Design a binder for these strands. Sequence first.
RNA 1: UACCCGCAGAAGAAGCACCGGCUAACUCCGUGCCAGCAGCCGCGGUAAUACGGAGGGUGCAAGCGUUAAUCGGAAUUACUGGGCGUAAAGCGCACGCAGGCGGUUUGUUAAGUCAGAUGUGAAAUCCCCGGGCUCAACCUGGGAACUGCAUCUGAUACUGG
RNA 2: UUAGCUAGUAGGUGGGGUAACGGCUCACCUAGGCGACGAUCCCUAGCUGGUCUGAGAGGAUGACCAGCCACACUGGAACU
Lengths: 123, 80, 156, 205, 129, 82
Amino acid sequence: ATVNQLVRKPRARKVAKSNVPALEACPQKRGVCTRVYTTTPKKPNSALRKVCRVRLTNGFEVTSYIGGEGHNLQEHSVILIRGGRVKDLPGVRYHTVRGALDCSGVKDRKQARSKYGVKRPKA
Amino acid sequence: KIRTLQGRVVSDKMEKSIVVAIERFVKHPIYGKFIKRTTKLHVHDENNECGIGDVVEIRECRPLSKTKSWTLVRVVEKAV
Amino acid sequence: ELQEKLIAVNRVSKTVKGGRIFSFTALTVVGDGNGRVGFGYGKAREVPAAIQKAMEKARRNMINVALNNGTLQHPVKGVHTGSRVFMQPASEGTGIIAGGAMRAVLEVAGVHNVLAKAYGSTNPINVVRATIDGLENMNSPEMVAAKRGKSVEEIL
Amino acid sequence: ARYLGPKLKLSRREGTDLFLKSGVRAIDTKCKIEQAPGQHGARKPRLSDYGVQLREKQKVRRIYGVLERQFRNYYKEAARLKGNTGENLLALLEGRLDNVVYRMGFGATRAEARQLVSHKAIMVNGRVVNIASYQVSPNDVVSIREKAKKQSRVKAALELAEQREKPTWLEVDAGKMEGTFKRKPERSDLSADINEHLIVELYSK
Amino acid sequence: SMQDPIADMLTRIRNGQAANKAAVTMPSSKLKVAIANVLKEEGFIEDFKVEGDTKPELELTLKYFQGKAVVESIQRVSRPGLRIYKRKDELPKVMAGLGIAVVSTSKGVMTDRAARQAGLGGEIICYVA
Amino acid sequence: MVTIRLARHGAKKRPFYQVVVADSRNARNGRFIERVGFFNPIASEKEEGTRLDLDRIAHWVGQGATISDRVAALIKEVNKAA
RNA sequence: UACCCGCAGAAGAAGCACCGGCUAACUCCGUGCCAGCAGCCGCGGUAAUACGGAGGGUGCAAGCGUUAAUCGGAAUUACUGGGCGUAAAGCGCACGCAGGCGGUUUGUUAAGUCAGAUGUGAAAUCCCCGGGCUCAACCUGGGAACUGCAUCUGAUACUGG
RNA sequence: UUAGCUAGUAGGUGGGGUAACGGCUCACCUAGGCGACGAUCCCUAGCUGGUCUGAGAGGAUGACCAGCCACACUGGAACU
Ligand SMILES: [Mg+2]
Ligand SMILES: [Mg+2]
Ligand SMILES: [Mg+2]
Ligand SMILES: [Mg+2]
Ligand SMILES: [Mg+2]
Ligand SMILES: [Mg+2]
Ligand SMILES: [Mg+2]
Ligand SMILES: [Mg+2]
Ligand SMILES: [Mg+2]
Ligand SMILES: [Mg+2]
Ligand SMILES: [Mg+2]
Ligand SMILES: [Mg+2]
Ligand SMILES: [Mg+2]
Ligand SMILES: [Mg+2]
Ligand SMILES: [Mg+2]
Ligand SMILES: [Mg+2]
Ligand SMILES: [Mg+2]
Ligand SMILES: [Mg+2]
Ligand SMILES: [Mg+2]
Ligand SMILES: [Mg+2]
Ligand SMILES: [Mg+2]
Ligand SMILES: [Mg+2]
Ligand SMILES: [Mg+2]
Ligand SMILES: [Mg+2]
């Protein structure tokens, strides 16, 4: 804390790592679905979380949560991830964009429709 | 009137050339402390007339050599 | 008259043989729209009883603050136990730029133009004590003139 | 870029009158001005400090009909200009052309004054001005042009302006359907229920 | 070691006030005298006095108003580890002008207000408030 | 060679020309030596649309600077108004 | 082309997110640790203001949200502006080179320092006072500023020599 | 968790060379030179006016506009 000590060895900052390294400072990355499956969550919760193992374009192979009810996802399906982790899943750091390039919008969803890629239901 | 500087003589082993430690006294840009900073210059001397530990006064001239562009004007504190 | 603000309510506990006993705490501050400010801390099994005990203790133990027109007189600091607090006199109509409990205590203090900042722990009890101590030891040009034995104009 | 819905819903939310209608019929007749809108309108919840700062800023916006980005830029300008920020903010809201038209009583509401501006019925210093947010400098004349001078709603608005209190900082000539923005108004000339410090504290996080 | 007498002077004042001491003595100096000259003129101490010839002892008569101390706060600014020099525009206002900043200028030791009226800055010794 | 010329610094469809002294190999709006005024072709009444430091212009011409055709027009219009 | 004049008639022109707390804004019906939400705390096991729909409301608005990224908040690398008995943190102790600091008095120096002047610090940009496009955005005149460096002239309290 | 680097290297004399000083080059002589105030090595990187943020100090950054540098398939070379 002595000013001489700070002259000789300055105040170093904290290089903050990114919790989405596969995006490589991109907002979305195109991937290809390798394996679509379910996962049981942590102990306080209990479900079957829909999650896909994806080979990306940059070369990484990461898993990604599939939001919403229902999905037409298969293997060899071309999706677009966007970043954002599921807390109640170990190792899932990404969300699939519903309504992008193979993924369909949520069936018969009428609220929050843009977070799931659903057109406006005409009356 | 000409701009000139002073400093101790560090080495004198090479002929017609001495090395001079000019010790400027600057403030730190952040912490405000005044820190001595040392500048070494290769100085041309005719006659090899200076010694180690000697104070000298130098001016800037045309480049004599690769690393040498300074020539003394006079000597203060010649002896040990 | 004396405007009254509760800052925060809190539910506390006390474990006994039967189990947990819950209670409620209330932190209230009163003021006259001028330098007369005072705080209270009441506690009861029920929230309206706690605010009433707090307003009762706050109406007494008031403290007097030498204000300026509507602001402070010099940049003052106040501490209590977790809360270093800086506050600064400001220009007219810049508002109360203050955090949480300090806004309420200065509003009933009748101040209207401050630039404040609460460092450290922001527990409302200690930060309201730290503001009360800062305003209390803030001194006027008259008090410093009588103290140094000079005029106000010799002090400028 | 305008609010086009129900207006008394806004006055009911703010709890007071905003003069959003002409004041011919009484507002307590046209609406339950003491009850908030909606299913859960009867309940009055314990409103937070952010709530009162928001409701005050949405009051002033819903009075003058200014959207948020523009009201933010008025805050930026009022903080830049010298003196009291809240007073300069109200002086900028009162310098709007559609307010000057309302205060001169050429339109019954501020929206109708806005429509007269947008529909090319106002000459400023002889020159036609189509913009609602045109700032009106002191010592400026502002007139109804010739063709819309014969409108019914204009002299009906002058009747209601005679029912309303006359502002000091103006000087209107109801025969010529013109006026004169003499000076910027003082804070004392305006309403006293507007707590402008809540807005300054809102945009001063 | 005694690296700094001026902070020893200020500390003996500060502890004298907190101890309700009437007078405070210390080894004198030309600078400690010029500072006690300033503190008497500005009204914080009653009187100073230097006695002795070979090693002079400076005695300060402290000042108490309404029981409590006059000197509410006194702080060292420039220190041997870190000197502080300011220009005449960047001179500080202690307590918004209520306190003073003892400044050493080429024309002697004065307060910050007289340094501004003199149009010249120098070394900030202490904040007295 | 060194020349004296205009430099388009305006909005679209509403130009405004800084009359500058520049080495002619540089760009139009680029590097210059000395700005010796301006010209506004969309100048309203009761505003200046032409202001030229004619002392500096005669200084650079004494140094051998050339004059553009419009600058020499604006020097004519100044020396005819004045 | 701007711009202006004329015609007809409210016609040709509003959506997005959110409503457990933080965080402005609530009720109902499905639903049953399922389906699913999620920034954090956390919701969901038959009466879910937290899921999904509806009604209502709130915030923005030709945009609204999400994601990525930077600063801020964070006094959470603390120069301003932090700490080290027990919360992370005093080397096991010591001598000691370089280095940092240095009692008191007089004289000198003027390096630091302070003041002033000169040159420079491109323009633009930021800021101030104005001007011009129906306003604004924008454009623009003038100024301040660029906290710096160099030289010279002084000052001598402090520090250094 | 890079501590030693350097023989045209460092300097000198003379000759050559360039628009020009100069190891720029050559011969000879001398044995130096840099480095803990970080040499050398490694990774990364065009620089600035400025931009964003911030009460400020600071932090991050260098798209557009303007100033300098560098390159023009890659590696080299010279001519005019
Ligand atoms: Mg804490
Ligand atoms: Mg818009
Ligand atoms: Mg202002
Ligand atoms: Mg709420
Ligand atoms: Mg239910
Ligand atoms: Mg929620
Ligand atoms: Mg941070
Ligand atoms: Mg920080
Ligand atoms: Mg700490
Ligand atoms: Mg332990
Ligand atoms: Mg420990
Ligand atoms: Mg120990
Ligand atoms: Mg000493
Ligand atoms: Mg000097
Ligand atoms: Mg100077
Ligand atoms: Mg500039
Ligand atoms: Mg204008
Ligand atoms: Mg001395
Ligand atoms: Mg001296
Ligand atoms: Mg030769
Ligand atoms: Mg040669
Ligand atoms: Mg590169
Ligand atoms: Mg900060
Ligand atoms: Mg090539």
